[PDB]
Ligand SMILES: Cc1cc2nc3c(=O)[nH]c(=O)nc-3n(C[C@H](O)[C@H](O)[C@H](O)COP(=O)(O)OP(=O)(O)OC[C@H]3O[C@@H](n4cnc5c(N)ncnc54)[C@H](O)[C@@H]3O)c2cc1C
Ligand SMILES: Cc1cc2nc3c(=O)[nH]c(=O)nc-3n(C[C@H](O)[C@H](O)[C@H](O)COP(=O)(O)OP(=O)(O)OC[C@H]3O[C@@H](n4cnc5c(N)ncnc54)[C@H](O)[C@@H]3O)c2cc1C
Ligand SMILES: [Cl-]
Ligand SMILES: [Cl-]
Ligand SMILES: [Cl-]
């Protein structure tokens with residue numbers, strides 16, 4: 001048995017931040033537990049968390065790889081000549097370079113533990129034995145061989161989320177994003193199930209790397225992909241995915257999946273339609289990872305959705321037990337889990353309580369082309385503010401009339417409280433959107449108004465400068481109703 | 488008819504500034520406006536045309552050409568992500584680039600053309616504008632004041648918006664050299680080229696010629712002092728030098744051409760002041776741009792010039808003559824299109840809108856489209872350090888993740904924030920690497936709202952991006968205390 005000031009269950013974004021800050025800013029004794037030290041099967045997430053191993057970082061590399069499909073084709077407009085028939089996308093080379101890059105980060109975090117005093121790493125499955133004891137076991141079976149027992153005065157739960165699998169017959173024929181990262185070969189025909197950013201991002205990855213005669217289909221059970229994003233943007237990205245050869249099946253949901261004699265999958269939709277594919281990747285949701293923690297042993301309370309319930313400072317119902325990051329089922333983003341972990345350790349080991357602000361958080365979707373957003377979409381703004389204005393600009397950038405990708409419209413929309421000009425949200429679609437939106441998140445912390453954008457001098461020629469050129473609302477919401485003139 | 492025409496405002500120069508002023512005077516305030524320019528569409532002999540330098544031989548076509556040049560990196564970098572193709576078959580077709588560019592520019596030319604037909608009170612006159620007197624602009628067939636008169640335009644107010652022009656140094660064999668204007672029209676990409684100058688135009692062109700050079704080629708950039716891009720962040724100056732070298736560009740600093748002659752094969756033989764020599768197919772001089780005031784006949788009305796040669800103006804763009812104003816590059820200040828545009832809008836609001844307004848020339852964001860590019864806004868540290876007793880510099884430099892796989896590990900991203908350490912106010916932000924021009928725009932908005940470093944640091948990052956580094960810097964890398972560089976406060 002071993003003592004500590006902080007035991008962190010889960011060496012991911014939120015937990016490495018919390019642990020690192022405690023060991024180094026406040027010189028506490030920290031233990032951190034995870035099930036695996038390097039990425040991949042069988043447990044996928046590992047030292048560094050979801051982001052590093054099966055998340056933001058490898059997805060970004062693979063989206064970057066998929067973008068060359070457009071680049072190679074678009075180069076001809078600017079005079080570039082080569083043998084187009086010689087072009088092939090080697091997925092194994094992609095995956096191998098991606099794995100090497102992720103493994104470098106893994107080795108780097110191992111070195112971080114070996115080099116930082118008062119921060120120890122424990123390999124295996126952690127769970128709550130009592131209010132101040134964490135057990136680590138050989139496997140996730142609450143019953144396997146104990147490896148270590150750790151008493152702790154404070155306990156941080158930061159075990160993240162896991163893909164949700166619907167309970168349809170044949171679900172075990174489907175993969176999740178976890179397995180997608182390791183596919184031996186690029187699927188020829190693939191169905192991504194879901195309308196959110198993971199389904200959209202992988203559909204473009206697979207679309208770029210599919211072999212000759214490939215097809216990517218994305219299905220979603222409701223009418224329009226990317227619920228929660230700007231409505232013009234959802235429509236436009238739908239249109240740009242279609243122009244790049246992806247087939248979008250809206251109002252469709254798998255009812256079952258079966259095995260074909262050749263090893264491919266036979267998907268039957270609730271509507272009766274059928275599709276044969278090599279891979280069915282479910283990306284319908286991620287759920288808080290709470291099962292393995294034996295939370296009953298101490299009474300830590302859950303919300304009706306399955307998140308560990310927390311107050312604004314991340315405290316559970318049981319004193320000295322905390323929860324940050326995806327396990328709380330709030331904003332599922334890496335930097336938000338990091339900010340929670342830092343605010344928590346500031347509150348508990350330093351002294352200036354700090355709470356994470358969950359409004360006006362900027363985020364991105366690495367679709368092709370990508371989306372960058374911060375703050376409210378207009379239909380949510382229309383329910384809290386009596387007068388809302390929407391400034392909108394949309395057009396194909398001149399580089400994309402030369403490249404031949406004419407379908408590539410840039411969209412910039414600014415939503416305001418029309419009573420005092422306060423910017424409430426900014427929504428972007430087009431090359432560079434994720435990069436443009438970062439400093440827009442700072443603007444929103446400063447309560448920028450539309451006149452602060454419009455009075456700023458443009459950087460020319462950029463897409464971003466569009467945000468500084470809008471003076472006149474394209475339309476309004478008054479008391480929740482959409483209209484073109486103010487009444 | 489054979490009678491002069493009358494206007495509230497005559498603008499000489501239909502470019503960035505003049506078109507903004509004219510359009511706004513006509514459409515917002517119902518003035519009667521004339522705009523004069525020398526050519527309706529781009530290209531020789533006069534290069535700039537309706538739409539200005541920006542549209543014809545500046546921002547717009549250079550960005551299309553830098554975008555074309557970036558495919559050289561994209562093609563190469565694709566291999567690290569598993570793209571395979573016949574490398575040996577790769578050609579850069581400069582003539583296709585130039586054709587595509589001319590066609591895009593000409594489309595813009597044509598759309599300005601129809602704006603004039605349907606805008607009531609906004610008229611275009613072709614030829615050369617000069618001041619005959621306080622209320623009469625004469626338009627002539629050429630820049631020579633003896634050339635024939637095409638029109639006389641009566642004007643209550645006159646706006647000088649004639650922009651700037653490349654400067655040519657008076658060295659022997661200067662006639663064998665070209666400027667950026669000709670560079671846009673060269674029939675063939677040069678095998679060997681010297682770009683003379685260390686400013687943005689020389690650097691951006693070096694990148695473009697480097698991508699499109701034929702098989703045995705070489706781009707050399709020379710600069711008379713010791714480090715390119717004066718006026719920019721010093722770290723970024725040194726790093727951009729390294730990245731350009733890494734891409735096969737030869738940077739010769741502390742070198743200056745003394746003379747140029749023709750070898751017997753027709754190539755250019757450049758001798759430097761050091762006595763070093765270089766043979767090239769093209770010498771592009773880009774040592775500076777000067778205000779275009781010579782053709783205006785300013786002596787006729789007594790408009791004063793600064794020592795530097797620009798039209799002297801007050802904060803409201805007024806000259807020493809009551810109803811004659813000047814904006815844009817002719818005033819030899821900040822030579823940027825959106826600055827000319829903002830000056831034009833402010834001037835018109837002031838004169839005809841009764842809502843006085845002056846352009847703010849501080850904290851203007853701007854970009855260099857070098858490969859890799861720069862985005863910058865506000866003070867560089869050594870300027871800040873002369874004005875503020877305590878200055879903190881936050882600095883981060885990293886290889887973005889993609890370049891761990893691409894092959895281009897030399898592509899370091901640099902992000903610097905310079906602050907007044909007494910109260911945390913951001914004084915300057917300086918960025919080098921892919922996306923920097925796009926990231927920096929909203930930074931301009933932050934600086935105009937007096938952001939502090941903690942406004943940055945408390946903002947949650949968008950992950951994974953390069954921009955998020957701006958919102959993860961909490962501890963100075965170093966300081967200046969009463970002008971003195973030091974890694975810690977005393
Ligand atoms: C495909 C995909 C793409 C994504 N892209 C982005 C993006 O672009 N930008 C963004 O901001 N966010 C992105 N995310 C979300 C981001 O990955 C998460 O929000 C983030 O990782 C949450 O961090 P966390 O600390 O809550 O959990 P995690 O980082 O998931 O860490 C949990 C850790 O706990 C370990 N663990 C679980 N149970 C136990 C146990 N009982 N004992 C010991 N260890 C355990 C796991 O092995 C894991 O390493 C993406 C997610 C996915 C799935
Ligand atoms: C190569 C290059 C690249 C550039 N890149 C950028 C960039 O990326 N971003 C940026 O912001 N700025 C850029 N600039 C600068 C930008 O082009 C100028 O700051 C801007 O055009 C200034 O606008 P203006 O209205 O002062 O003058 P202009 O746009 O130059 O307009 C002046 C007009 O007056 C006309 N004219 C001149 N004399 C007369 C006369 N006597 N009678 C009638 N008409 C006349 C000319 O034909 C011209 O059309 C670049 C410039 C160059 C040369
Ligand atoms: Cl769905
Ligand atoms: Cl819907
Ligand atoms: Cl060619």
Ligand SMILES: [Cl-]
Pocket residue numbers: 683684685709710711712743774
């Ligand atoms: Cl020089």
Ligand code: NA
Pocket residue numbers: 113114115116117118119120121
């Ligand atoms: Na350690």
Ligand code: NA
Pocket residue numbers: 943944945946947948958959
């Ligand atoms: Na931050």
